[PDB]
Design a protein around this ligand. Structure first.
Ligand SMILES: [Zn+2]
Ligand SMILES: [Zn+2]
Ligand SMILES: [Zn+2]
Ligand SMILES: [Zn+2]
Ligand SMILES: [Zn+2]
Ligand SMILES: [Zn+2]
Ligand SMILES: [Zn+2]
Ligand SMILES: [Zn+2]
Lengths: 362, 362
């Protein structure tokens, strides 16, 4: 009755430690990952302090090693000050993250020349991912071509963006992309229900036509990734609502529902949550690691999932078919039926494994 | 000085056992693979007897388990008689092989309707690969669309073929392909040197324009695979020369030379000899497995490589830069500097590993 899946990989999570641990920490966020059938996460650098230099990375690595329940890699973040300074720690990170749209964090870049400087100085064999919306997708593709390297586009959300990426792939350009579940399963039609606070997310929810274009262009989507962006309900409903949705615990059930309806195949799902994350980010295999799912169980998403400290979900009320029953991580039962059974600190930094280093020429 | 690579995968080898063991057997062919930095091979079914039914597969599996020095999976072959009969053993094979062009083997299919029957009956979640040249590529793509599934095209060799596949990918069709080293590094310019016997191969050597089109369209190529097709020199130089080149021991040195010249990156190479073979054929990771190469050593390909029983090579005289120094397979030293150090039978059928089954819906 159960289907065995390999250990799934989420290449875009915000786990809020250090500095935002009321929203999530490594222990709670990786519990959420495990309950979602995810055994490896790549954590974004917009923490407090942000992971924009070697001391911050070193702190974050130890916090993750002590708190993570599944395996992980940590992104470095590009800043207006750190191009040309990250070479000695670059290979220990998941990759470099560029935040190219609205932000007031230390991740704000003022000029496309600063993007160029990062593409020129970051080691050419290591991943670069960009938060790049609408025309910014075309702009960062131009910078990638000028510097003769690849780029990965985070959370593609619009018809405009997926068609631009499709055209770039047709010209043989080295671009990959990911899509998040809220841009496949929510739209403007859901904003009345969500309200303006909860509904705040970046990239924003798309139109019905945006959602339909992403499904129609599934072949263009290399990865699914949650952009798990936990904020508390108080924050989402307050005066200055921060953008983002929690998503680790709902991603796989939503996508399994779509598989059961014939909207994509099981293989399509596994390419996008396992094989392509591995190959784009050079993430290592996890020995004796698998996920068992029950594809027949129908349930309704509640007002909050059990594990994320966000304690809310924008998918409340959606009917799904598919549920994670058991997760085994490196030979240990990590999750069964609503209970996480590996402690904080069980998880490891996959970039320290010999198989987890990105290959490079001498 | 050495670069560590993951265990490389060759998804297209002819190892001639059972029934052609003067040309190669599992022990010699997998020694050649190891010396070429290859730790997993997928063996084609045009043996004697051909692997076209369950008893033949069972025999071949035991011969491989007893003789293989690296890990393997075995293809089943489509025949005019076996559509609808392979369901119980299908998941134990690498995939199903369709031979769609000239052959008088029991693999000859008389009609496109027989291709359709195989696409309709072979389990939808399992790989299908096709030997399909020139217009046959378009024809088998049509059959794949009519039956609503994917297909993998073996050894793409012509501008015509790679541009057709490029157009199909631009329309979002589920097609992947592989290219063999002789179609990247040899051309019509080499037929005077090779002669008409040695030069016999299918697909035939292309023009300079064919070779240049494959390089220009590298983005369209998902895998490299040798189409290691050993025949003895007596056979190649005799009256009815069989088509095919040995290639396991020369593939990686040729491609490393191209990397050193900037014709493709190390990552481009590893996507095509590791990550994409894994994901197209659902081949499992190999624990504690890696290849160490020396990228600085210049050498000239001799008149025969040490291990293949073919005892000749069409790349004789080419200057290369790059050589396999050490292979570790599942924690054992398998190859060092011209000596294979694991015995026949060390290799295993990866489809019997729990991680080697192709996932499917219940
Ligand atoms: Zn983002
Ligand atoms: Zn991302
Ligand atoms: Zn994000
Ligand atoms: Zn890799
Ligand atoms: Zn062939
Ligand atoms: Zn093939
Ligand atoms: Zn072949
Ligand atoms: Zn797989």
């Amino acid at each position: 009755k159960l289907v065995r899946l390999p250990g799934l990989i989420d290449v875009h999570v915000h786990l809020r430690e250090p500095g935002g641990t009321h929203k999530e920490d490594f222990a709670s966020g990786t519990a959420a990952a495990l309950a979602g059938g995810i055994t490896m996460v790549c954590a974004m650098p917009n923490t407090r302090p942000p992971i924009i230099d070697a001391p911050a990375l070193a702190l974050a690595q130890k916090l993750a090693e002590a708190g993570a329940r599944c395996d992980f890699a940590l992104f470095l973040g590009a800043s207006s000050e750190n191009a040309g300074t990250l070479g000695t720690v670059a290979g220990s990170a998941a990759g470099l993250k560029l935040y190219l749209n609205e932000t007031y964090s230390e991740l704000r870049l003022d000029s496309v020349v600063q993007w160029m400087e990062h593409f020129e100085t970051w080691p050419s064999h290591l991943p670069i991912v960009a938060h790049a919306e609408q025309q910014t997708v075309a702009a960062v593709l131009m910078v990638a071509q000028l510097t003769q390297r690849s780029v990965h586009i985070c959370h593609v959300a619009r018809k405009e963006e997926i068609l631009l990426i499709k055209a770039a792939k047709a010209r043989g350009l080295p671009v990959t992309c990911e899509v998040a579940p809220h841009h496949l399963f929510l739209s403007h039609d859901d904003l009345e229900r969500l309200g303006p606070g909860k509904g705040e997310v970046r990239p924003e929810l798309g139109s019905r036509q945006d959602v339909e274009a992403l499904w129609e262009n599934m072949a263009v989507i290399d990865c699914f990734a949650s952009d798990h962006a936990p904020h508390t309900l108080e924050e989402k409903c307050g005066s200055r609502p921060p953008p983002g949705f929690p998503g680790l615990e709902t991603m796989l059930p939503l996508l399994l529902t779509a598989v059961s309806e014939g909207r994509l195949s099981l293989d399509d799902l596994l390419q996008r949550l396992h094989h392509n994350p591995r190959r784009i980010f050079h993430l290592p295999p996890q020995e004796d690691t698998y996920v068992e799912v029950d594809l027949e169980h129908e349930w309704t998403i509640p007002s909050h999932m059990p594990f994320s400290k966000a304690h809310w979900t924008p998918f409340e009320g959606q009917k799904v078919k598919g549920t994670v029953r058991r997760v085994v991580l490196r030979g240990e039962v990590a999750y069964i039926d609503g209970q996480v059974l590996v402690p904080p600190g069980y998880g490891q930094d996959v970039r320290k494994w010999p198989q987890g280093a990105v290959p490079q020429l001498p």
